C-alpha cells in the first residue's frame, strides 16, 4: 500500500492540496467540496470502498457545504473534475471501486541533482 499526494491522469495534473488542475491551455479551478470527494478517493487510488462509509470521508472533510448529499456532489464534480469523475465506479454488489490506474507515486527520494 502507498498513499499518493498528487494526481496525474493523461495531459492533466491535479493537486490534492491545491484544488486546481493545470490544462494544456492553462488551468482549471473547481469547488473544494466536490473536488474533496475525489481528493479522498485519490488517497487510495484504485481500491474497494463503500458508499455510506464514504460519507465518513466526505464528512471528515466538509460534507458538501452546498448540497444535499455526497452522491449528488460527485455528479457535479464530474463537471469540474473531468474524466476523473467517472473514475468512481458504483458496482451493484461490490460498492465503490474508483478504479484509476494503480501506478502510485511514493515520494521515495527527497531530491534529485547529480550528473547522469
Amino acid at each position: 500500500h502507498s498513499v499518493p499526494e498528487s494526481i496525474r491522469f493523461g495531459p492533466n495534473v491535479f493537486y490534492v492540496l491545491k484544488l486546481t488542475v493545470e490544462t494544456p491551455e492553462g488551468s482549471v479551478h473547481l469547488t473544494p467540496s466536490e473536488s474533496g470527494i475525489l481528493k479522498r478517493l485519490l488517497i487510495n487510488k484504485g481500491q474497494l470502498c463503500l458508499r455510506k462509509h464514504l460519507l465518513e470521508e466526505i464528512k471528515n472533510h466538509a460534507k458538501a457545504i452546498v448540497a444535499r448529499n455526497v452522491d449528488v456532489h460527485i455528479a457535479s464534480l464530474r463537471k469540474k473534475l473531468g474524466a476523473y469523475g467517472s473514475r468512481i465506479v458504483t458496482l451493484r454488489g461490490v460498492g465503490y471501486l474508483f478504479s484509476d490506474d494503480g501506478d502510485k507515486k511514493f515520494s521515495q527520494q527527497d531530491t534529485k541533482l547529480s550528473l547522469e
Side-chain angles (χ1 to χ4, degrees), residues 1 4 15 30 33 38 56 68 82 84 89 93 98 101 104 106:
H1 205 88
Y15 293 85
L30 79 187
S33 301
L38 87 91
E56 308 201 19
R68 62 220 243 181
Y84 222 110
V89 190
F98 45 92
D101 222 306
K104 256 129 259 265
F106 209 50

Side-chain angles (χ1 to χ4, degrees), residues 35-50:
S35 96
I37 298 104
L38 87 91
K39 179 195 146 115
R40 286 256 41 199
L41 270 56
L42 250 289
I43 315 307
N44 269 240
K45 201 112 147 309
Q47 264 261 245
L48 216 308
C49 268
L50 300 308

Side-chain angles (χ1 to χ4, degrees), residues 4-106:
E5 246 175 85
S6 212
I7 318 176
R8 229 280 215 77
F9 54 101
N12 275 342
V13 188
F14 197 119
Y15 293 85
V16 288
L17 265 306
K18 222 157 170 108
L19 315 160
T20 310
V21 59
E22 248 139 21
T23 33
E25 193 192 49
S27 223
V28 177
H29 281 108
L30 79 187
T31 28
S33 301
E34 298 173 33
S35 96
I37 298 104
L38 87 91
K39 179 195 146 115
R40 286 256 41 199
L41 270 56
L42 250 289
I43 315 307
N44 269 240
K45 201 112 147 309
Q47 264 261 245
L48 216 308
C49 268
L50 300 308
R51 207 208 268 87
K52 305 202 108 134
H53 186 103
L54 222 106
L55 293 23
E56 308 201 19
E57 322 202 309
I58 317 284
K59 179 188 142 185
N60 219 131
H61 215 302
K63 49 119 221 142
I65 188 111
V66 68
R68 62 220 243 181
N69 303 303
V70 60
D71 254 24
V72 200
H73 232 43
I74 295 200
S76 183
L77 177 58
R78 185 221 175 76
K79 218 212 71 147
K80 313 236 140 61
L81 174 38
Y84 222 110
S86 217
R87 222 100 289 164
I88 309 107
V89 190
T90 312
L91 282 136
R92 240 60 206 280
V94 198
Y96 258 49
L97 196 286
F98 45 92
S99 26
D100 178 19
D101 222 306
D103 256 286
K104 256 129 259 265
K105 292 281 250 271
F106 209 50

